[PDB]
Design an enzyme around this catalytic site. Structure first.
Site, PDB file in Angstrom:
ATOM      1  N   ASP A  35       0.894  -1.263   0.172  1.00 19.67           N
ATOM      2  CA  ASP A  35      -0.155  -0.078   0.042  1.00 19.67           C
ATOM      3  C   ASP A  35       0.774   1.364   0.077  1.00 19.67           C
ATOM      4  O   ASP A  35       1.468   1.530   1.090  1.00 19.67           O
ATOM      5  CB  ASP A  35      -0.857  -0.026   1.434  1.00 19.67           C
ATOM      6  CG  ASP A  35      -1.714   1.397   1.265  1.00 19.67           C
ATOM      7  OD1 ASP A  35      -1.902   2.017   0.334  1.00 19.67           O
ATOM      8  OD2 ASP A  35      -2.229   1.362   2.638  1.00 19.67           O
ATOM      9  N   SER A 199      -0.592  15.631 -11.982  1.00 18.37           N
ATOM     10  CA  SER A 199      -0.770  15.222 -13.460  1.00 18.37           C
ATOM     11  C   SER A 199      -1.112  16.410 -14.463  1.00 18.37           C
ATOM     12  O   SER A 199      -1.714  17.615 -13.935  1.00 18.37           O
ATOM     13  CB  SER A 199      -1.945  14.327 -13.701  1.00 18.37           C
ATOM     14  OG  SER A 199      -2.489  14.013 -14.955  1.00 18.37           O
TER      15      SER A 199
END
Length: 330
Positions: A35, A199
């Site tokens: 994770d 992004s």
């Protein structure tokens, strides 16, 4: 040193991925959920409340000759999805894919929430976010990666998750045969303890690319792709009959649909998520309403590039002095 381990979807939907991890002496192999959005290595154990164990493999520290109680240490974690666990702490030897760390904090669960109990395939979590998020008190502990880093050939790990197929986590090296083209690296902020990056935009299907900054985290422990409501609405508007259902808890779509792809930007590069990756199947057995793999982050407070996005790429988690993230197509 290096390590290399195969990671395998837990079910037919890729709801999560498990990777075998050797703990203790002699080895006890547990299948852990790696994770990159948290920083605790915790396991089902001989100390876990018996009614909260249902099929998981447990770690038994009393059977490990290298286990030592970390005196006075406790831990307690709550995840974004509302699940939680807590307990006490041992140090022991932990190996992943041939890479061994001695003195790793292994957090033994005394209590786990229902979602953990109900998932018989996940024996615990191995956190790969920054150690500043580790919950051990009164002495915070380091992640497996942080402990291994100095010994690694290169201070990196990579995630290569499969679509409905196994994939690989590598530690200490970049497998140049595992991706196509080049890797595009992008800046990381560690201010919130995550692999947080920005992004450069998105496209829906064959549509034009929208240049827009989307700050979010690369999180292998989250199943879906959570993005701003504007972006998500633009995606689902291209699917006839798709709608947001408050009763179901997100966007659903007719199971008869063909889903468009979704592209996200990494610098000037582009990663394309095929439409099929966005299908999470019937909302309930036999339903013709299917659950979407792109959902709104509104009210989460952060955008999350979860498995839906990451499995479309070869992802480098570069833990150099100034960390960065790399993405390549594959």
């Amino acid at each position: 040193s290096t390590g290399s381990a195969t990671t395998t979807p837990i079910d037919s939907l890729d709801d999560a991925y498990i990777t075998p991890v050797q703990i203790g002496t002699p080895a006890q192999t547990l299948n852990l959920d790696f994770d990159t959005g948290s920083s605790d290595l915790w396991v089902f154990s001989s100390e876990t409340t018996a009614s909260e164990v249902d099929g998981q493999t447990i770690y038994t520290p009393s059977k490990s000759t290298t286990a030592k109680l970390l005196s006075g240490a406790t831990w307690s974690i709550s995840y974004g999805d509302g699940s939680s666990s807590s307990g006490d702490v041992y140090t022991d030897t932990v190996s992943v894919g041939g890479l061994t760390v001695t003195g790793q904090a292994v957090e033994s669960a005394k209590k786990v929430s229902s979602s953990f109990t109900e998932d018989s395939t996940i024996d615990g979590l191995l956190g790969l976010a920054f150690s500043t998020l580790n919950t051990v008190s009164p002495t915070q502990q380091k992640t497996f990666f942080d402990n291994a880093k100095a010994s690694l050939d290169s201070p990196v790990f990579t995630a290569d998750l499969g679509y409905h197929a196994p994939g690989t986590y590598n530690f200490g090296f970049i497998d140049t045969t595992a991706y196509t083209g080049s890797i595009t690296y992008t800046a990381v902020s560690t201010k919130q303890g995550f692999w947080e990056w920005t992004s450069t935009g998105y496209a829906v299907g064959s549509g034009t690319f929208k240049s827009t900054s989307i700050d979010g985290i690369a999180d292998t422990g989250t199943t879906l792709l959570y993005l701003p409501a504007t972006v998500v609405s633009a995606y689902w508007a291209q699917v006839s009959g798709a709608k947001s259902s408050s009763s179901v808890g997100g966007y659903v779509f007719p199971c008869s649909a063909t889903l468009p792809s979704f592209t996200f930007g990494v610098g000037s590069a582009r990663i394309v998520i095929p439409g099929d990756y966005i299908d999470f199947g019937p909302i309930s057995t036999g339903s013709s309403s299917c659950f979407g793999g792109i959902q709104s982050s509104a009210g989460i407070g952060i955008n999350i590039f979860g498995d839906v996005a990451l499995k479309a790429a070869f992802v480098v988690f570069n833990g150099a002095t100034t960390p960065t993230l790399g993405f390549a197509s594959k």
